[PDB]
Ligand binder design. Structure first.
Ligand SMILES: [Cl-]
Ligand SMILES: [Cl-]
Ligand SMILES: [Cl-]
Ligand SMILES: [Cl-]
Ligand SMILES: [Cl-]
Ligand SMILES: [Cl-]
Ligand SMILES: [N]
Ligand SMILES: [N]
Ligand SMILES: [N]
Ligand code: NA
Ligand SMILES: [Pt+2]
Ligand SMILES: [Pt+2]
Ligand SMILES: [Pt+2]
Ligand SMILES: [Pt+2]
Ligand SMILES: [Pt+2]
Length: 129
């Protein structure tokens, strides 16, 4: 599924991401935009053989099992395929664990390089929240 901007904002808010670990909703929508362009089916292969999955491009090195990332962990205890669902619950629940790991949203390289320090509120402007 390709979410609309405000559609994704609303789902993320409902699932408890707004100000989660102190990160405003706009940060999460911005991250999603530049990670997946709001596409739940987005996948991207990393040089180390791990794969990023879903709206927030959560990686199999640490966070999900795809049966094909040697040495990896599955700290969110999910198949990586669950991150591709039109239902974003697994993505959000896992993102909550990631952003609590100590580095906050810097865990998402695209967030650090394209969202951090920007007017992230713009990503939820206009939305009925
Ligand atoms: Cl957009
Ligand atoms: Cl915001
Ligand atoms: Cl594996
Ligand atoms: Cl959902
Ligand atoms: Cl959730
Ligand atoms: Cl933080
Ligand atoms: N949802
Ligand atoms: N939720
Ligand atoms: N949730
Ligand atoms: Na894994
Ligand atoms: Pt879909
Ligand atoms: Pt939902
Ligand atoms: Pt939820
Ligand atoms: Pt929660
Ligand atoms: Pt777009």
């Amino acid at each position: 599924k390709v979410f609309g901007r405000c559609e994704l904002a609303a789902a993320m808010k409902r699932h408890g991401l707004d100000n989660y670990r102190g990160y405003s909703l706009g940060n999460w929508v911005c991250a999603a935009k530049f990670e997946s362009n709001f596409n739940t089916q987005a996948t991207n292969r990393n040089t180390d053989g791990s794969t990023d999955y879903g709206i927030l491009q959560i990686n199999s090195r640490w966070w999900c099992n795809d049966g094909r990332t040697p040495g990896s962990r599955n700290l969110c205890n999910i198949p990586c395929s669950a991150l591709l669902s039109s239902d974003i619950t697994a993505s959000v629940n896992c993102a909550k664990k990631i952003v609590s790991d100590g580095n906050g949203m810097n865990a998402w390289v695209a967030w650090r390089n394209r969202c951090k320090g920007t007017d992230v509120q713009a990503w939820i402007r206009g939305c009925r929240l």
